[PDB]
Structure 1
Amino acid sequence: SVQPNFQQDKFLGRWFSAGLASNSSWLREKKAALSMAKSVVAPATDGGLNLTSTFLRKNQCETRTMLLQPAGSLGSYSYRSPHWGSTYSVSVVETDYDQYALLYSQGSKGPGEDFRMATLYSRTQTPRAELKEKFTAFCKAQGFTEDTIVFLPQTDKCMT
């Protein structure tokens, strides 16, 4: 479920995408060949969030923004992907705002319906070991097997 009493304004700002788990081998593999720089969460004009990730793909920097539209309880969003012809729920299921957040995404419509992913965001680029465990704990509870849980390579290229 969503983080109780979720406060969007405290989730804003700079995060690092430190880990992910997913039932898509392809997505995990594609992501692990990228080197992650910052993600930034900024308010969207629709009352939701823009989630922008900066990353290195074949030694070249790229940025991608996902619009997370408000969907259910505070902390629950939906992301519509024209490229995948699918929509996906995205929820901040646990966070303490000042060190970590766990996001859980599931396909809700379209061929992406079966996709599931958990992401660990950390306010620091190397998460303390406590936070890795909070992530791997959650992934296990949600039925991700140990080889689908991966920690993502990081870089300081692509920023400033």
Structure 2
Amino acid sequence: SVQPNFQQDKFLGRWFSAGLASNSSWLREKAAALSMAKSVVAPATDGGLNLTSTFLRKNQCETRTMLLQPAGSLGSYSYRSPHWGSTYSVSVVETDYDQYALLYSQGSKGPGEDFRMATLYSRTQTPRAELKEKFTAFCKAQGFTEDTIVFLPQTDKCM
């Protein structure tokens, strides 16, 4: 499932990782200890996206980039991780480009095949309560129970 008529150029730029739901208890545990700073979406050489995430981990600013390679429908991508020995489908399911994006990721190959994650991205680091409600509803409709939905800690550091 992808955002209809997806316009990759409008999806570019600065976003904030406001929320997460996943069926990985491990990932939820780790993510709740990270304080999110800012994320940047930039066009990649292969026609996909480079996603750069900046966050505070144990009082240290860290930034990590991920390559999202194009995968069929516009707005759908694949992420290859030799560390997880797996490939993941990453899709922009719903976005208005200028305020929010709801992403859904799932394993497509390898041991990580059963992995599932929904992500809320916002153009402000402090999104409206109605957007948080939208994300909660989206997560539940994707099969995530309430207690697997995480609104992530945020930081002013690392900007």
Same fold (TM over 0.5): yes
Aligned equivalents of 1:59 and 1:110: distance in 2? 33
Identity %: 99
Aligned equivalents of 1:53 and 1:72: distance in 2? 24
Aligned equivalents of 1:49 and 1:75: distance in 2? 10
Task: Note the alpha carbon deviations across 1:85-126, whole angstroms, 9 max, x for none.
Answer: 000000000000010000100001111110000000000001
Give SS of 1:53's match: strand
Matching residue of 1:107: 107
- Displacement, 1:133? 1.3
Matching residue of 1:90: 90
- Displacement, 1:130? 1.5
- The gaps in structure 1 that reach 5 residues or longer are none
Aligned equivalents of 2:16 and 2:55: distance in 1? 11
Task: Note the alpha carbon deviations across 1:38-72, whole angstroms, 9 max, x for none.
Answer: 00000000000000000011100111100000002
RMSD value, Cα: 0.5
Q: How does 1:7-22 map to 2 (within 5 A)?
A: 7-22=7-22
**Residues matched between the structures, number:** 159
Aligned equivalents of 2:19 and 2:25: distance in 1? 14
- The gaps in structure 2 that reach 5 residues or longer are none
TM-score (norm 2): 0.99
Superposition misfits of 4+ residues, deviation over 3 angstroms: none
Aligned equivalents of 1:120 and 1:154: distance in 2? 13
- Displacement, 1:156? 1.1
TM-score (norm 1): 0.98
